[PDB]
Amino acid sequence: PTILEVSCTVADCIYSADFGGSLTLQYKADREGHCPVHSHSTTAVLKEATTHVTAVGSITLHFSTSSPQANFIVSLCGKKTTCNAECKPPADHIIGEP
Amino acid sequence: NNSGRPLQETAPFGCKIEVEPLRASNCAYGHIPISIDIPDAAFVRSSESPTILEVSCTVADCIYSADFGGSLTLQYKADREGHCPVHSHSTTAVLKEA
């Protein structure tokens, strides 16, 4: 399924080792399938890899970033959209994760 | 004979003076800073609680008072049925429902 029109709306985000960022992709596609989602930046990584895509709807995804600002392109079945955000400093000081 | 009035009828801020031990109960004054470490079990990731695509607010007739005399309506669009919390981030407004 090659999606037709997708847009990105980013919720509260934070730059830390843990997955302290969330966003939503509002998509309009043509078939029910298993589209692969990805991040096209070196300073952001998603949690989910393959997401069930419907005809029209939304998908919520998580991400971790190292930049103070989320200024990164997310790709869904090839279609690219630039997510613009503003991530605050982390609340914690130390983590048990890399 | 010249004892005057007791402190029960003169203590400001409406603090009820009680004895054994001497103390003032329900003395409403100032603010207290409270730091709460909420357990990690209560929190849930954003992918479970239904994010809402958009919300529009329409305020009905209101009177600024102590009682919950003001009303409003929120037109919401979401992707799933859930139990969302509602808050007012202004200092001069509070909500009956949370």
CSV table of C-alpha atoms in Angstrom, one decimal:
chain,number,residue,atom,x,y,z
A,1,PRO,CA,0.0,0.0,0.0
A,2,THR,CA,1.4,3.3,-1.2
A,3,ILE,CA,-0.1,5.9,1.1
A,4,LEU,CA,-1.6,9.0,-0.5
A,5,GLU,CA,-1.3,11.9,1.9
A,6,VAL,CA,0.4,11.8,5.4
A,7,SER,CA,1.1,14.5,7.9
A,8,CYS,CA,3.0,14.6,11.2
A,9,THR,CA,1.8,16.1,14.5
A,10,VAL,CA,4.3,15.9,17.4
A,11,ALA,CA,3.4,15.7,21.1
A,12,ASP,CA,5.6,16.5,24.0
A,13,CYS,CA,9.2,15.3,23.4
A,14,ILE,CA,12.4,15.1,25.4
A,15,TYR,CA,16.0,14.3,24.4
A,16,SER,CA,17.2,11.4,26.6
A,17,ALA,CA,18.4,7.8,26.3
A,18,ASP,CA,14.9,6.4,27.0
A,19,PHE,CA,12.0,6.8,24.5
A,20,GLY,CA,10.8,10.1,25.9
A,21,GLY,CA,9.2,11.4,22.7
A,22,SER,CA,5.8,10.7,21.0
A,23,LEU,CA,4.2,11.8,17.7
A,24,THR,CA,1.2,11.0,15.5
A,25,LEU,CA,1.1,10.4,11.8
A,26,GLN,CA,-2.3,11.2,10.2
A,27,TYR,CA,-2.4,9.2,7.0
A,28,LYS,CA,-4.7,8.6,4.0
A,29,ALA,CA,-3.8,5.5,1.9
A,30,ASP,CA,-5.5,3.1,-0.5
A,31,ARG,CA,-5.2,-0.4,1.1
A,32,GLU,CA,-4.8,-2.3,4.4
A,33,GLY,CA,-1.2,-3.5,4.9
A,34,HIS,CA,2.0,-3.5,7.0
A,35,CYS,CA,3.8,-0.4,6.0
A,36,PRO,CA,7.3,0.2,7.3
A,37,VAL,CA,7.9,3.4,9.2
A,38,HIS,CA,11.4,4.9,9.6
A,39,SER,CA,13.2,8.1,10.7
A,40,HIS,CA,15.5,9.7,8.1
A,41,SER,CA,17.7,11.5,10.6
A,42,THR,CA,20.9,10.6,12.5
A,43,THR,CA,19.6,12.2,15.8
A,44,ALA,CA,16.3,10.4,16.2
A,45,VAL,CA,15.2,6.8,16.4
A,46,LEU,CA,11.7,5.2,16.5
A,47,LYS,CA,10.5,2.3,18.5
A,48,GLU,CA,8.1,0.5,16.1
A,49,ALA,CA,9.4,-0.7,12.7
A,50,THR,CA,6.3,-2.1,10.8
A,51,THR,CA,2.9,-0.5,11.4
A,52,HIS,CA,-0.5,-1.7,10.2
A,53,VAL,CA,-1.7,0.9,7.7
A,54,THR,CA,-5.5,1.3,7.0
A,55,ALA,CA,-7.3,3.1,4.3
A,56,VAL,CA,-7.5,6.4,6.3
A,57,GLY,CA,-6.6,7.0,9.9
A,58,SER,CA,-3.8,7.8,12.4
A,59,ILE,CA,-0.9,6.0,14.0
A,60,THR,CA,0.8,7.0,17.3
A,61,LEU,CA,4.6,6.3,17.5
A,62,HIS,CA,7.4,6.8,20.0
A,63,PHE,CA,10.9,8.1,19.4
A,64,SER,CA,14.1,9.1,21.2
A,65,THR,CA,16.2,12.0,20.1
A,66,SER,CA,19.5,13.6,21.1
A,67,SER,CA,18.8,17.1,19.6
A,68,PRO,CA,17.0,19.9,21.6
A,69,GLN,CA,14.7,20.3,18.6
A,70,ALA,CA,13.0,17.5,16.7
A,71,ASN,CA,13.7,18.8,13.1
A,72,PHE,CA,13.6,15.4,11.4
A,73,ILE,CA,12.0,13.7,8.4
A,74,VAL,CA,9.8,10.6,9.1
A,75,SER,CA,9.2,8.2,6.2
A,76,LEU,CA,6.1,6.0,5.9
A,77,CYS,CA,6.0,3.6,2.9
A,78,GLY,CA,8.4,6.1,1.1
A,79,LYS,CA,6.4,9.2,1.8
A,80,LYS,CA,8.5,11.8,3.7
A,81,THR,CA,7.2,14.4,6.1
A,82,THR,CA,9.3,16.8,8.2
A,83,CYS,CA,8.4,16.7,11.9
A,84,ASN,CA,9.1,20.0,13.7
A,85,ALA,CA,9.1,20.0,17.5
A,86,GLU,CA,10.9,21.5,20.5
A,87,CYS,CA,12.2,19.0,23.0
A,88,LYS,CA,12.8,20.1,26.6
A,89,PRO,CA,15.8,19.1,28.8
A,90,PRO,CA,15.3,15.7,30.5
A,91,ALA,CA,14.0,15.7,34.1
A,92,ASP,CA,16.2,12.9,35.4
A,93,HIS,CA,20.0,13.1,35.8
A,94,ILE,CA,21.1,9.4,35.5
A,95,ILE,CA,19.7,6.4,33.7
A,96,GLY,CA,20.4,2.7,33.8
A,97,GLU,CA,20.2,2.5,30.0
A,98,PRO,CA,22.7,3.6,27.3
B,1,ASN,CA,-14.0,38.2,86.0
B,2,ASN,CA,-11.8,40.3,83.6
B,3,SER,CA,-10.6,37.4,81.5
B,4,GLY,CA,-11.9,38.8,78.3
B,5,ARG,CA,-12.7,36.6,75.3
B,6,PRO,CA,-10.8,33.3,74.7
B,7,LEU,CA,-8.5,32.9,71.8
B,8,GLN,CA,-11.0,30.5,70.2
B,9,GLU,CA,-13.1,33.5,69.3
B,10,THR,CA,-10.1,35.7,68.2
B,11,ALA,CA,-7.6,33.5,66.4
B,12,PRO,CA,-7.3,34.8,62.8
B,13,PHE,CA,-7.6,32.7,59.6
B,14,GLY,CA,-10.4,30.6,61.2
B,15,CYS,CA,-8.1,28.2,63.0
B,16,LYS,CA,-10.0,26.1,65.6
B,17,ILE,CA,-8.0,26.2,68.9
B,18,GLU,CA,-8.1,22.8,70.7
B,19,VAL,CA,-6.4,21.7,73.9
B,20,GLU,CA,-4.5,18.6,75.1
B,21,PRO,CA,-2.2,19.3,73.3
B,22,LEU,CA,-2.7,23.0,72.6
B,23,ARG,CA,-3.0,23.4,68.9
B,24,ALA,CA,-4.8,25.1,66.0
B,25,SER,CA,-6.6,22.8,63.6
B,26,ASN,CA,-7.6,23.9,60.1
B,27,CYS,CA,-5.5,27.0,59.9
B,28,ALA,CA,-5.8,28.1,56.3
B,29,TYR,CA,-2.9,30.4,55.4
B,30,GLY,CA,-0.3,30.6,52.6
B,31,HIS,CA,0.9,27.7,50.4
B,32,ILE,CA,2.9,24.6,51.0
B,33,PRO,CA,5.4,23.2,48.4
B,34,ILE,CA,4.9,19.4,47.9
B,35,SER,CA,7.2,17.1,46.0
B,36,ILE,CA,5.6,13.8,45.0
B,37,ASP,CA,7.5,10.9,43.5
B,38,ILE,CA,4.7,9.1,41.6
B,39,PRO,CA,5.3,5.4,41.1
B,40,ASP,CA,6.3,4.3,37.6
B,41,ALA,CA,3.4,1.8,37.4
B,42,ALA,CA,0.7,4.5,37.2
B,43,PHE,CA,2.1,6.0,34.0
B,44,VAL,CA,1.2,4.6,30.6
B,45,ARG,CA,2.7,5.2,27.2
B,46,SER,CA,1.1,7.6,24.8
B,47,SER,CA,0.3,4.8,22.3
B,48,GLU,CA,-2.4,3.4,24.7
B,49,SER,CA,-4.3,6.4,25.9
B,50,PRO,CA,-6.2,7.8,22.9
B,51,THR,CA,-4.6,10.9,21.5
B,52,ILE,CA,-7.1,13.4,20.1
B,53,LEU,CA,-6.6,14.8,16.6
B,54,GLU,CA,-8.1,18.2,17.4
B,55,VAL,CA,-10.2,20.0,20.0
B,56,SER,CA,-12.3,23.2,19.8
B,57,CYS,CA,-13.7,25.1,22.8
B,58,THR,CA,-17.0,27.0,23.0
B,59,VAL,CA,-17.7,28.7,26.3
B,60,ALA,CA,-21.3,29.1,27.4
B,61,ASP,CA,-22.6,31.8,29.8
B,62,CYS,CA,-20.3,32.2,32.8
B,63,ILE,CA,-20.1,34.3,36.0
B,64,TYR,CA,-16.9,34.7,37.9
B,65,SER,CA,-17.6,33.5,41.4
B,66,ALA,CA,-16.7,30.8,43.9
B,67,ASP,CA,-19.2,28.2,42.8
B,68,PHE,CA,-18.8,26.2,39.6
B,69,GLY,CA,-21.0,28.8,37.7
B,70,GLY,CA,-19.2,28.7,34.4
B,71,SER,CA,-19.7,26.2,31.6
B,72,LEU,CA,-18.1,25.2,28.3
B,73,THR,CA,-18.2,22.6,25.6
B,74,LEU,CA,-15.3,20.8,23.9
B,75,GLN,CA,-15.7,19.3,20.4
B,76,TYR,CA,-13.1,16.6,20.2
B,77,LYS,CA,-11.9,14.2,17.5
B,78,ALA,CA,-10.0,11.1,18.6
B,79,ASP,CA,-8.9,7.7,17.3
B,80,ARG,CA,-10.1,5.5,20.2
B,81,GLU,CA,-12.4,5.4,23.1
B,82,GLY,CA,-10.7,6.2,26.4
B,83,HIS,CA,-10.6,8.0,29.7
B,84,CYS,CA,-8.7,11.2,28.9
B,85,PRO,CA,-7.9,13.7,31.7
B,86,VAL,CA,-8.9,17.4,31.5
B,87,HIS,CA,-7.1,20.2,33.1
B,88,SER,CA,-7.0,24.0,33.1
B,89,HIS,CA,-3.4,25.4,33.0
B,90,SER,CA,-4.4,28.9,34.0
B,91,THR,CA,-4.0,30.1,37.6
B,92,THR,CA,-7.5,31.8,37.7
B,93,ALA,CA,-9.6,28.8,36.5
B,94,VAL,CA,-10.4,25.4,37.9
B,95,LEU,CA,-12.4,22.4,36.6
B,96,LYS,CA,-15.1,20.3,38.3
B,97,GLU,CA,-14.0,17.2,36.3
B,98,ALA,CA,-10.5,15.8,36.1
